[PDB]
Design a protein around this ligand. Structure first.
Ligand code: CL
Ligand code: CL
Length: 162
């Protein structure tokens, strides 16, 4: 198991523009296109991202390329973030993937906001962090995914994904 396989399970890989859990236009493995209600705007963003007139449809390779870029960007965002970097540096390889997953889903700013949970993760207080992470809109809105990530932080294993 690795970060890509993990996110593939959590996000899937759709080849036609679709609406995410929040009703926003997305493509591939959770690549948000726009928060605008407009399908046209979505299509415009898609074409700009892939570099061709797509007509709302991407090929598998194109989607995968977007996926690779997004994973790379999440990691880099973490490393550049003053609040995130120290937690990431303190974790083992499995838990680092869990942190990457949260950043991929909610953006750096969003995760950076879980102040208390981050401090707990940094102190290796696993069960405490898991409880804290669960008190969030994130857990209430996408519970199954949040439980998978939470368990990963709690145990340090990939059990929730196997
Ligand atoms: Cl892009
Ligand atoms: Cl879910």
């Amino acid at each position: 198991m690795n970060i890509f396989e993990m996110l593939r399970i959590d996000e899937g890989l759709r080849l036609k523009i679709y609406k995410d859990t929040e009703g926003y236009y997305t493509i591939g493995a959770g690549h948000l296109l726009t928060k605008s209600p407009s399908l046209n705007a979505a299509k415009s963003e898609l074409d700009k991202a892939i570099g061709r007139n797509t007509n709302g449809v991407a090929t598998k390779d194109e989607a995968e390329k977007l996926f690779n870029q997004d994973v790379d960007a999440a990691v880099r965002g973490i490393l550049r973030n003053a609040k995130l970097k120290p937690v990431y540096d303190s974790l083992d390889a499995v838990r680092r993937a869990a942190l990457i997953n949260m950043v991929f889903q909610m953006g750096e700013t969003g995760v950076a906001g879980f102040t208390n949970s981050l401090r707990m993760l940094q102190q290796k207080r696993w069960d405490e962090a898991a409880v804290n992470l669960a008190k969030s809109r994130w857990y209430n809105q996408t519970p199954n995914r949040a439980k998978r990530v939470i368990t990963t932080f709690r145990t340090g294993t990939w059990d929730a994904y196997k």
